[PDB]
């Protein structure tokens, strides 16, 4: 029944010859630069672990730490602080160059190695029995930034990754401030990279990225800015100008940001969250706002392949970009469903309904 | 009906996965359920024992001399270990066939350890490495056995697939039109039917083994089902491989049950009559089928193991061999425990 559809029915679905294979629940929030909710899928206020989608907020805490500007981190360095990188040799090299700028060493890192987020990098590692170490962590840039912050204020580097350290105190305050939430409304776990990681309603993730894009807009216009807005503009610029540092070759975040050529930034969170900050454009205006836009997505069951398909479909439905811009992501949008003999056996479809002509008696129960 | 398995990071919900499950008696009557026990579901590799039945029921196939390990391979989603490839080639030799006659393709190994070995050695898997290579060799065997020709053995209009289609519905006790069909990863037709009927197949496998073991006047079909159960339980390493859930499950239970994975996170178990099954209020064998709605295998194995615990199937000791699947490790790159898995669902009885 098309006239009683509900958020509980917002799915991305795979089929095999028309027969349902898997289905995945979708949550999404589209917010303006003050966080007002414009469009939604599923439960746009789902309490959600941001994971690496929080990294631009953590980078802001680092950049607002007094004395860090003296280290001479450049834009590509800041993009690495914002990264879940593929552990390509260029990311490892930049991590070592950042350690040298702050006079630290790999032994000071409290993140650990892991299989590369790139299958092609990981294939090279397997061929040489290479065991990844702390410096190959996808989060290595954030960790060097955190060491830099710790050294800059005289706190000392041991323990920089623990909640009681002033660097983590700065992070926690900064996250809650960008979300416009009280401390008690942000929850904290421990991340795979061994730092505190926040959880907050999904729409507030979109709000953070709308603030990133809004600051970029104010910077490009030559508006006076607070030190925080200037730094947010710097983070947006770094990510958009060095998207290979934020992920790597063949990675969704890198291909998405290169396709849009400065119009937006986007960032993955583990277990299938995504956030995009969209600069003010004709597209955003047609969606009903005068400023920048934020988009946040969570696939309830954590499937990454579905996340990238859904994010790309959502950009298409919001009219963000052109068909030629978004066609660079066609392989993510409609993932291949081909068997071991080259036969196409199925595909992906998007039975969700953006909400933002319905009878007023149709309840939209966030689910 | 709102039955989930949930992972958390420090008590904070990370992911949740919808679970469907059917526990049936030997005649398929529903005894316990999670979610939607009649969910229309692609059985994928969990259908392979029924495809093995079609092969073994083909006239002339017994003349090839397949043994219980070969039949176990027909029923398998093997890890493509060297020993699976070797048995595949041995089975081709028994029917005087060539790897070039197989119509399945190579794929990255279902064992990441095997796959890593392949990567290190620049190995490109071919048809004989397919996890379903035993099924395809059996299909070639049945095609040759009735003189139908190996050409096109995997196509729906070939009599071997006609036999498979008919056998799947007969075992489900469904009319042909109630089973839907697509194309599998291994390039054969693959069936979809309500989830509880997958449990029904496996209860019939275990029931047949109980009847064989009991000296009961069986048809040739029940005798073949009994043989299929015996081959899987005696050679579980062929059905999956070292470290695989199916192999470890069947080894732990030492003949009391067979279990089989289906791609995109289905699972089927046939349980022979036991103190545990009588405790569940049935005087015969039992079948269990499970589907994780979003396709996550890690959650599948954890749920199945929890389900065996809730049903009292096995002893705590026997199930503890599966502890690493039951509560998956949730540790970060520095050895800190960051989370865990919870099972807020409740079995509903009849
Ligand atoms: Cl260094």
Author numbering:
A (entry chain B): -3 to 352, 357 to 367
B (entry chain A): 4 to 353
Task: Give me lines lifted from the publication on this model.
Asparaginases (EC 3.5.1.1), which split L-asparagine to L-aspartate and ammonia, are grouped into three unrelated structural classes: Class 1 (bacterial-type), Class 2 (plant-type), and Class 3 (Rhizobium etli-type). ReAV is a homodimer with an α/β protomeric fold, formed by two tightly packed domains.
The crystal structure of this mutant revealed that the absence of Cys135 caused small structural rearrangements in the active site area, almost identical in the two subunits of the dimer, and triggered a collapse of the metal coordination site, since the mutant protein was unable to bind the Zn2+ cation. These water molecules form strong hydrogen bonds with the Ser48 Oγ atom, with O…O distances in the range of 2.4–2.7 Å. In the close vicinity of these waters and Asp187, we observed a bound polyethylene glycol chain in subunit A or a glycerol molecule in subunit B, both located at the exit of the putative active site. The side chain of Ser48 is H-bonded to the Nζ atom of Lys51 and the Oγ atom of Ser80. The pattern of H-bonds at the two lysine residues from the Ser-Lys tandems, Lys51 and Lys263, is roughly the same as in the WT protein. Only one conformer of Asp187 is visible in the electron density maps, with one of its Oδ atoms forming an H-bond to the Nε atom of Arg47. Interestingly, the side chain of Cys249 does not carry its typical chemical modification, which may be linked to the absence of the Zn2+ cation in the protein structure. The structures of the C135A and C189A mutants demonstrate that alanine substitution of the cysteine residues involved in zinc coordination led to collapse of the metal binding site and abrogation of the L-asparaginase activity.
